[PDB]
């Protein structure tokens, strides 16, 4: 698709058999989802935030479907205003910025 | 309002 | 142009005689820059992301040159860790996400 920016670039994702809404976010290195449980193997991580570091759980090699485009990579889980898809997965689905 | 970028 | 997301989508912007490196950020509603004297009245605002909120000054009707495109709109100024071009200006220059 081509997604314009007059509205927030929210799309439906599938992860662990659940549908969720997420923001396509070019300003985020990483993908950060709201609190949820996810299949197996996570490590504690800290990510740079506003006013300091926030604690997240890092899951590696997680399959995520974004508008029916397959990605597999690192998904962080923690206190985010909104589910955010970052460049780590945007790159995998071939997403570019154009003007 | 929300500027949701992250490092 | 087409900007891939392998790396942060950083571009040079100009405001008046002032150069800033800024992140093209589809996850941001607004445009926020640090250390900028801007002409005109401003009003206090608080804007949030991962980590929490910062206090900024909202200036309206500010011309911003972005890769040869003339944007004019709201520019927030405060202690953002990286300078950000948000959807308010990205739309004006015809920026989309494509995959």
UniProtKB/TrEMBL annotation, chains A, C:
GO terms for biological process: proteolysis. SUPFAM superfamilies: Acid proteases. GO terms for molecular function: aspartic-type endopeptidase activity. It is a lipid-anchor. Signal peptide: none annotated. It is found in: Host endosome, Host multivesicular body; Virion membrane. Residues 20-89 form the Peptidase A2 domain. Keywords: Aspartyl protease, Host endosome, Hydrolase, Protease. Transmembrane segments: none annotated. One of its GO terms (cellular component) is host multivesicular body. This is Protease. It comes from Human immunodeficiency virus type 1.
